[PDB]
Design a protein around this ligand. Sequence first.
Ligand SMILES: *CC[C@H]1/C(=C/c2[nH]c(/C=C3N=C(/C=C4\NC(=O)C(CC)=C4C)C(C)=C\3CCC(=O)O)c(CCC(=O)O)c2C)NC(=O)[C@@H]1C
Ligand SMILES: *CC[C@H]1/C(=C/c2[nH]c(/C=C3N=C(/C=C4\NC(=O)C(CC)=C4C)C(C)=C\3CCC(=O)O)c(CCC(=O)O)c2C)NC(=O)[C@@H]1C
Ligand SMILES: C=CC1=C(C)[C@@H](Cc2[nH]c(/C=C3N=C(/C=C4\NC(=O)[C@H](C)[C@H]4CC)C(C)=C\3CCC(=O)O)c(CCC(=O)O)c2C)NC1=O
Ligand SMILES: C=CC1=C(C)[C@@H](Cc2[nH]c(/C=C3N=C(/C=C4\NC(=O)[C@H](C)[C@H]4CC)C(C)=C\3CCC(=O)O)c(CCC(=O)O)c2C)NC1=O
Ligand SMILES: C=CC1=C(C)[C@@H](Cc2[nH]c(/C=C3N=C(/C=C4\NC(=O)[C@H](C)[C@H]4CC)C(C)=C\3CCC(=O)O)c(CCC(=O)O)c2C)NC1=O
Ligand SMILES: C=CC1=C(C)[C@@H](Cc2[nH]c(/C=C3N=C(/C=C4\NC(=O)[C@H](C)[C@H]4CC)C(C)=C\3CCC(=O)O)c(CCC(=O)O)c2C)NC1=O
Ligand SMILES: C=CC1=C(C)[C@@H](Cc2[nH]c(/C=C3N=C(/C=C4\NC(=O)[C@H](C)[C@H]4CC)C(C)=C\3CCC(=O)O)c(CCC(=O)O)c2C)NC1=O
Ligand SMILES: C=CC1=C(C)[C@@H](Cc2[nH]c(/C=C3N=C(/C=C4\NC(=O)[C@H](C)[C@H]4CC)C(C)=C\3CCC(=O)O)c(CCC(=O)O)c2C)NC1=O
Ligand SMILES: C=CC1=C(C)[C@@H](Cc2[nH]c(/C=C3N=C(/C=C4\NC(=O)[C@H](C)[C@H]4CC)C(C)=C\3CCC(=O)O)c(CCC(=O)O)c2C)NC1=O
Ligand SMILES: C=CC1=C(C)[C@@H](Cc2[nH]c(/C=C3N=C(/C=C4\NC(=O)[C@H](C)[C@H]4CC)C(C)=C\3CCC(=O)O)c(CCC(=O)O)c2C)NC1=O
Ligand SMILES: C=CC1=C(C)[C@@H](Cc2[nH]c(/C=C3N=C(/C=C4\NC(=O)[C@H](C)[C@H]4CC)C(C)=C\3CCC(=O)O)c(CCC(=O)O)c2C)NC1=O
Ligand SMILES: C=CC1=C(C)[C@@H](Cc2[nH]c(/C=C3N=C(/C=C4\NC(=O)[C@H](C)[C@H]4CC)C(C)=C\3CCC(=O)O)c(CCC(=O)O)c2C)NC1=O
Ligand SMILES: C=CC1=C(C)[C@@H](Cc2[nH]c(/C=C3N=C(/C=C4\NC(=O)[C@H](C)[C@H]4CC)C(C)=C\3CCC(=O)O)c(CCC(=O)O)c2C)NC1=O
Lengths: 172, 172, 164, 164, 324, 116, 177, 177
Amino acid sequence: MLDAFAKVVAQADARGEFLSNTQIDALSKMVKEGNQRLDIVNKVTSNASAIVTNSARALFAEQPQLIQPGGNAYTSRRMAACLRDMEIVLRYVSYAMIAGDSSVLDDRCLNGLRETYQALGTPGSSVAVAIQKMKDASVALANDTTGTPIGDCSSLVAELAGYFDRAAVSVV
Amino acid sequence: MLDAFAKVVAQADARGEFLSNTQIDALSKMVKEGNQRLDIVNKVTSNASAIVTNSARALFAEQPQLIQPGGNAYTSRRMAACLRDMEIVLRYVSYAMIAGDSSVLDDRCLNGLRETYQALGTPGSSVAVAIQKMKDASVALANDTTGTPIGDCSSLVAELAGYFDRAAVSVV
Amino acid sequence: MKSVITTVVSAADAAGRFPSNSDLESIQGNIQRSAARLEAAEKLAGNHEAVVKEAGDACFAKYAYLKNPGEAGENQEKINKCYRDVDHYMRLVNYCLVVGGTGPLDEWGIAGAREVYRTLNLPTSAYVASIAYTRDRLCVPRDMSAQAGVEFSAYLDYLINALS
Amino acid sequence: MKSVITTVVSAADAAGRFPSNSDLESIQGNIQRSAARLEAAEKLAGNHEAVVKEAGDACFAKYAYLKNPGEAGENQEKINKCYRDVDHYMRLVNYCLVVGGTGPLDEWGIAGAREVYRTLNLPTSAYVASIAYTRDRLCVPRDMSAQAGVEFSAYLDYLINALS
Amino acid sequence: RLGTVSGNSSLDKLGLDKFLSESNRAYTPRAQPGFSSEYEQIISATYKQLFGNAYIMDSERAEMAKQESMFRDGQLTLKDFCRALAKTEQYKKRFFDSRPLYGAIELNFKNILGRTPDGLEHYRAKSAVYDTKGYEAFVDAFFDDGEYDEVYDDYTVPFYRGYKTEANLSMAAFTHFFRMVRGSSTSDKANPNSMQKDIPLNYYGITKTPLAVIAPGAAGTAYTESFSGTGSWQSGRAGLNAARVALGVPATANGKSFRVEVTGYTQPGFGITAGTAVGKLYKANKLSRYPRSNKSYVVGFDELTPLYQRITKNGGTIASITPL
Amino acid sequence: QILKSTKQPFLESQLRFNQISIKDFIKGLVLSAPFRDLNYNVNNNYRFVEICVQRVLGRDIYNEREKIAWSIIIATQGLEGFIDTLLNTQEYLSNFGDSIVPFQRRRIIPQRSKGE
Amino acid sequence: MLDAFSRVVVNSDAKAAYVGGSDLQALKSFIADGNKRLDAVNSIVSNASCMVSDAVSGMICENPGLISPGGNCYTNRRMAACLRDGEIILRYVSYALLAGDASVLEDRCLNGLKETYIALGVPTNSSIRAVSIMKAQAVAFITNTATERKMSFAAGDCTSLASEVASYFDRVGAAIS
Amino acid sequence: MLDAFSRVVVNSDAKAAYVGGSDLQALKSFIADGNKRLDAVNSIVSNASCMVSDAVSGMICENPGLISPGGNCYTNRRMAACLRDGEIILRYVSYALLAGDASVLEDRCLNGLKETYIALGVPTNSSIRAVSIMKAQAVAFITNTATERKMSFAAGDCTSLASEVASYFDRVGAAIS
Ligand SMILES: *CC[C@H]1/C(=C/c2[nH]c(/C=C3N=C(/C=C4\NC(=O)C(CC)=C4C)C(C)=C\3CCC(=O)O)c(CCC(=O)O)c2C)NC(=O)[C@@H]1C
Ligand SMILES: *CC[C@H]1/C(=C/c2[nH]c(/C=C3N=C(/C=C4\NC(=O)C(CC)=C4C)C(C)=C\3CCC(=O)O)c(CCC(=O)O)c2C)NC(=O)[C@@H]1C
Ligand SMILES: C=CC1=C(C)[C@@H](Cc2[nH]c(/C=C3N=C(/C=C4\NC(=O)[C@H](C)[C@H]4CC)C(C)=C\3CCC(=O)O)c(CCC(=O)O)c2C)NC1=O
Ligand SMILES: C=CC1=C(C)[C@@H](Cc2[nH]c(/C=C3N=C(/C=C4\NC(=O)[C@H](C)[C@H]4CC)C(C)=C\3CCC(=O)O)c(CCC(=O)O)c2C)NC1=O
Ligand SMILES: C=CC1=C(C)[C@@H](Cc2[nH]c(/C=C3N=C(/C=C4\NC(=O)[C@H](C)[C@H]4CC)C(C)=C\3CCC(=O)O)c(CCC(=O)O)c2C)NC1=O
Ligand SMILES: C=CC1=C(C)[C@@H](Cc2[nH]c(/C=C3N=C(/C=C4\NC(=O)[C@H](C)[C@H]4CC)C(C)=C\3CCC(=O)O)c(CCC(=O)O)c2C)NC1=O
Ligand SMILES: C=CC1=C(C)[C@@H](Cc2[nH]c(/C=C3N=C(/C=C4\NC(=O)[C@H](C)[C@H]4CC)C(C)=C\3CCC(=O)O)c(CCC(=O)O)c2C)NC1=O
Ligand SMILES: C=CC1=C(C)[C@@H](Cc2[nH]c(/C=C3N=C(/C=C4\NC(=O)[C@H](C)[C@H]4CC)C(C)=C\3CCC(=O)O)c(CCC(=O)O)c2C)NC1=O
Ligand SMILES: C=CC1=C(C)[C@@H](Cc2[nH]c(/C=C3N=C(/C=C4\NC(=O)[C@H](C)[C@H]4CC)C(C)=C\3CCC(=O)O)c(CCC(=O)O)c2C)NC1=O
Ligand SMILES: C=CC1=C(C)[C@@H](Cc2[nH]c(/C=C3N=C(/C=C4\NC(=O)[C@H](C)[C@H]4CC)C(C)=C\3CCC(=O)O)c(CCC(=O)O)c2C)NC1=O
Ligand SMILES: C=CC1=C(C)[C@@H](Cc2[nH]c(/C=C3N=C(/C=C4\NC(=O)[C@H](C)[C@H]4CC)C(C)=C\3CCC(=O)O)c(CCC(=O)O)c2C)NC1=O
Ligand SMILES: C=CC1=C(C)[C@@H](Cc2[nH]c(/C=C3N=C(/C=C4\NC(=O)[C@H](C)[C@H]4CC)C(C)=C\3CCC(=O)O)c(CCC(=O)O)c2C)NC1=O
Ligand SMILES: C=CC1=C(C)[C@@H](Cc2[nH]c(/C=C3N=C(/C=C4\NC(=O)[C@H](C)[C@H]4CC)C(C)=C\3CCC(=O)O)c(CCC(=O)O)c2C)NC1=O
């Protein structure tokens, strides 16, 4: 797996190039927003249980065919499998958030996930619904100003939403 | 795997035939050149490091696109993979040389090798070049008269060159 | 999802060409009409429980035989599904007003509707009566602007031409 | 003959559908651009004697080897055909300014031009030099309006991207 | 049924069954005015073949009305009907607008020509037409070559021919046909390898490497795997699916080698028991026992019968066993 | 013995091409050629079985009788038969499976510093 | 095909003349009432479905021989074909009215319609009766002269567009006469 | 094909909610600088031909191994294929910049480009180097920061569109990484 620094390092190695000065400013401005990057993942980690539980609760309030008998969440073990599947994606999105790019998300979370749900008979579009319900639940929580100095961190919020989108289209 | 005796034994078994007398002379003349067969593999084994190293050195002197940055031998680990890939073929050719036929060469060296290099992006024609550079490096060394009684062993040399040719066309 | 942008990008993609001056010229018309087409959409959004209320019973005042036994509107949940069937169409009209083209209508409301209403034995004339009642008592200075009313009414009779 | 109207009627015809609201919406953009695209066209119409004159010799000032023996511009009628070849392109630029799309250019000037200029051994770099000279000394307040220069220059480098 | 022995035939058990029955030849040139059952059968067969089993609703079928029109007059099947059906906005929306170009190429070799391309040289002959002259000449490249008028009649519907030799392709494209055509109950939004959004074969048709034919309707037929090519020159990951080469010492130590693909892995049903084990049910990592279904293996000869115990007792189902 | 004469370049090249799994890699390492003269020729069958239980199964022996019991498979079936019947137990498959490197299972108590 | 803008381009291309400011005024007058042209086209597309059905029903109620056994609009298939035949004509006339030039139904609709109908046995009298009814409906919609339906427009005159759309319907009947 | 308008429709359709006046302001702000978006798209289409050729020439002059014998851009056919490969990417990024939504190159361009290049043997480092060069050219054209070419615009700020088009280029390299 690679973070954002190791990615440009692999780019520069695979053509044998010294890193230009402009790439050094591109990395220095990632260093510049380090505390703001850390605040987002800290706020997501502190609310991770309520994110998954409220998103899952709102999923079955509007898709009640899943928890009714015969559905793909009608058990206690299929239901516990669903909650733990949502925590997996919330975990790996937060890994990709501090990595700076989605290598660890694509590599050991999303690779082969669509085929898994097709083999199990799990409806992948309803997984895609639950992922976008966690997405804005975490985005609206990352725009909360309690416990942080007041400033701008909107581009990082868009970067965080991009990972949830990438995980959402990877599962249908 | 089979040697040359077990091959005619499998031929004779699969039609339930007793071995005719003429096949016994065909095997006795393989017994007749046993010391000359052993001398060839002994001379190849005693020079195995210099065969691989000189053939590999002459390969990049004329194909310098491989060791320049971006090539499929531009690392220290891809380069060490290439040298060790050449030793593999030199090992299994020498196995087939004392076996008398190319069952062990075809069976556990060349089977699936073209598909492996196609999956890795390794240029198989440049592997075929290096195999023929080891071929006459070993052939010209097997015609050396130091340490052996003076006699004829030319048909065995042609048999040795046949295995290198079979490994060369199996990799493109 | 047919719209102004969706048409010109598929035309340029089928020709295999870059966006030309005529492609950029068509989006200026979208810019000039957004200031009359969006008013109608949120006026419908802010008022839609009363407009579907007067359309659904106008459907039943014209065809009072629908509440007969053996019909499509016999008991109460059929009528509740009828009000829902009308609200679904008004939501799609709001969506086509927001998009700019008729994409949401022929994607989710029109395509396959004749097969559904035939085998489920629903009369399409009772559908078009409620839409025609909504179109005919749209009153253009009060309810909307002068230009938003023509944009709102042009999507309404698209449904009437599609269902009949 | 690609234009704003020609695109939307071909799309509605391939879909087999009537003109929708997005079809009528694109023509409003044509109406809004007609008042800046037509003055560039007649400004070119009223001035094309000198615009083609300064471009053709700018072609030869850059590439003076074209007047060598054995070349494309050896004697006088080749140069007279070169000025004609330039005037043909400026007329098509005027036509695309009048139409609205790039239809007259890729119908009569672009399609098949690479086969002609290769076998007749004409350098396309000498064609694009005269067009680039015309684009670079278009001077936006005096020669046109501010918006007409935007429109006139966008068709010029369409030729440069098509020939190179 | 299923198998290769019982009815003394093999190709109908692979789901090719309805495609061996009819011909749809369109006998008289124009439509006789007065009568219309025969031509409605031909129209429905052309929609079934050209769109590959999708539901053109009547609201959508009302706009190929001008194309059914001239076909009922004196105009062709192959040059008027099937060509103009590929240039309408119901075909373009499904097989061009949602796909990339190389997804649109294989979906036209399936619909129009009834086969699969092999190699790059079949793809790049058709993408070079698109990149120069647009989609409208990209469509005519399938009809106007030396392929359509030599295997198809002017009035027959273009049947599937990718499985037979008389389409003189190869043997790798024989097995690529059963990735595209999985029986008579399947469509293009409908197979798992392409859900009207991707390229169905991408790595496999470019490189011409063949894909083991799992028959549809078999026990364990929903086997599909992802792609992550190993090796560090292309910087890929090792550990996703098994190899297909049988290379080194474990090729022929422990006999000849095989490649088993198994598909259905579930969290209950591991242990040596009939029921699930209850308790905490996941480890500290809380992933799974098998973190993905559709695993494949490379096994020797006398490791095959214990691997067969280990697959089936643990709830897995074997898709295909090929030798190596 | 992570010296170079002990390293097998060929099990490694087959492991990173997904031809063999981790369980087959452990089987290749126990039956490997430097393991058969640096650990097998220097023990009896009784010490060698507790070596192979501690390093493959990740646990200590239960008592003396487990060593005496498993000691017979080595003698009558070779190292190959012994390592097959060891790697196919329920204990190995329930803990490591076919795709996890073995490790010393539950060595230290979690409160305490000093463990086993 | 050809709109009103490309028509003057193909007119001045045979001249090899630049499009100058003399003949451009016919094009800026085309822009000056483009809103009236869109307002006119919308009023026809809005109720084309009643326009077609009323025209075929009026043609049948004028000539009751078409629904006789062996008539050209006898069975359900032939009647559906007639309602399909009229709608295509209305669609192409709407295309030509939007484009400002008749050259879109010159070659896509009327090119070969003449002998198609007499290869089919379609009677040519009822075809021009139906489009004459459709023309009378279309002029009654460009102006607000329709009886039970009134659409809200801005005030002004639209007689030029009504004469233009009548001239688009005259050549349909002339192509099949 | 989803533009910026259909994106909020598919967002509010899962809600089964009418598009109200709260979330409409993000759409009227999209209309308020539509002229800036057209002014931005025109400046890229205007010199795409220099943009592609400069990008592949810079990728080659940075990595001279591609033009060695057996390199991926060695022969004339492979070099023409590379110049063809880059132009399609620029075309789809221009489509997404015009549409205001990235959903036109997620499914028509990048869906399957990842494994196409590694079935072909196309090196993934040089492709992201080339589109990074194309991104640096595109941001230098949305703003008037290019060196030898200056285009005349009305005064104002276009940094939002430059960040948007940069965000359209990073997912291209991320799709093939
Ligand atoms: C919101 C809940 C949705 C849902 C979930 C669901 N999932 C499963 C089964 C599996 N899910 C996975 C996925 C992963 N495993 C991993 O290790 C990782 C880490 C990268 C992921 C993303 C796997 C492998 C399985 C199968 C293993 C298993 O059986 O647990 C199940 C079924 C569980 C069962 O059938 O016993 C459900 C119900 N399904 C829904 O309907 C919701 C939309
Ligand atoms: C002269 C060097 C040429 C070259 C070699 C090269 N090979 C690889 C990678 C692999 N080679 C094999 C081949 C075998 N593995 C075996 O076990 C056997 C025994 C029968 C053979 C013949 C395999 C499986 C691989 C992949 C595993 C691995 O990664 O090592 C590599 C790439 C190594 C890497 O990418 O990390 C190279 C460079 N390549 C050349 O360019 C020379 C022509
Ligand atoms: C222990 C773990 C750990 C963390 C969680 C971070 C948290 C942290 N963030 C900031 C500092 C900051 N944190 C933020 C982030 C935000 N502010 C907002 O108003 C938004 C709600 C949110 C955007 C996502 C911003 C924007 C600043 C800089 C203040 C500013 O310029 O606006 C600072 C002060 C140092 C500085 O000035 O950068 C610290 C200590 N650092 C750590 O070591
Ligand atoms: C310890 C391992 C071991 C070996 C390496 C062989 C080596 C060996 N070779 C020969 C004997 C021989 N070896 C060779 C081979 C050659 N002579 C040449 O001139 C060529 C260079 C080369 C051909 C490849 C020949 C040809 C003879 C027989 C002499 C003759 O008739 O020419 C003899 C004497 C016995 C005999 O007469 O056959 C021995 C001991 N035997 C072994 O036990
Ligand atoms: C997204 C767009 C969308 C729609 C437009 C509707 C369309 C629609 N309506 C109904 C279903 C129905 N629609 C009606 C409505 C009516 N019946 C009448 O007599 C009147 C004509 C009218 C009320 C005024 C009724 C009564 C049913 C139930 C019919 C039945 O199940 O018996 C169904 C079948 C599924 C169901 O029972 O709900 C569908 C798909 N639904 C949608 O999801
Ligand atoms: C309707 C659109 C239209 C065009 C764009 C031109 C395109 C065009 N130019 C020429 C033909 C030519 N065009 C040129 C022009 C030039 N040669 C140069 O060295 C310079 C690059 C440039 C002058 C600046 C010349 C010299 C010929 C004559 C070539 C020859 O016949 O040897 C021909 C061949 C027929 C002929 O000889 O006239 C054609 C089709 N003609 C058209 O009808
Ligand atoms: C219809 C198309 C059309 C054009 C594109 C221009 C092109 C053009 N420019 C000039 C003529 C000129 N063009 C310029 C250039 C400029 N003038 C300035 O004040 C700025 C510094 C700069 C604009 C950025 C100058 C300074 C002259 C005067 C003579 C010269 O120096 O070339 C001339 C010669 C006739 C004249 O003097 O007007 C022509 C044909 N004219 C046209 O009719
Ligand atoms: C014997 C059978 C018979 C009929 C069925 C009717 C049909 C009919 N209606 C009109 C004539 C018309 N028909 C319409 C059409 C409509 N008006 C609307 O408000 C609706 C939107 C739309 C469908 C009803 C219009 C607008 C006119 C012109 C004004 C008018 O007469 O109402 C004409 C034209 C007369 C002519 O010039 O030939 C005919 C034949 N009349 C008949 O003689
Ligand atoms: C692009 C332009 C275009 C058209 C205009 C139509 C033209 C057209 N009409 C018909 C075919 C027909 N058209 C009519 C219509 C009529 N006959 C009458 O008596 C009435 C006067 C009139 C209805 C108002 C009938 C009755 C048929 C006969 C179909 C049949 O024979 O079953 C046919 C051939 C058979 C068929 O397609 O069904 C064609 C090509 N199609 C096109 O593609
Ligand atoms: C994209 C969709 C689109 C439309 C549907 C039309 C809508 C439309 N119509 C007119 C405007 C008008 N429309 C008419 C037309 C008529 N008035 C009559 O009384 C006659 C019945 C009828 C003749 C056909 C007239 C006379 C005007 C006034 C402006 C003018 O005369 O050009 C205007 C400009 C003034 C206004 O805001 O109302 C617009 C935007 N234009 C569009 O851009
Ligand atoms: C070793 C080989 C080598 C080259 C060939 C050049 C190529 C080149 N140019 C630019 C960078 C650029 N390239 C252009 C492109 C253009 N400018 C224009 O005015 C024309 C319209 C258009 C085609 C020439 C622009 C606008 C920039 C950004 C500003 C600039 O540097 O000029 C970059 C980006 C640097 C980066 O971020 O990686 C590169 C590699 N530089 C090199 O190092
Ligand atoms: C709709 C989206 C779409 C695309 C993006 C392209 C993608 C694409 N590129 C190539 C094919 C290729 N693309 C490249 C390009 C490159 N290799 C390099 O080393 C450079 C990094 C880079 C140029 C900048 C090369 C060299 C080929 C090889 C063609 C060949 O093998 O002859 C091929 C297959 C073979 C062919 O068509 O020629 C395809 C499908 N096509 C599409 O339809
Ligand atoms: C159909 C073709 C078509 C176009 C080519 C554009 C042309 C265009 N651009 C702008 C207008 C503008 N364009 C810009 C954009 C910029 N200014 C800068 O200094 C930056 C370099 C760049 C950012 C990308 C700005 C800032 C305005 C002023 C109006 C606004 O801010 O929205 C305007 C409105 C005001 C005017 O008349 O100039 C128009 C019509 N619009 C179109 O309809």
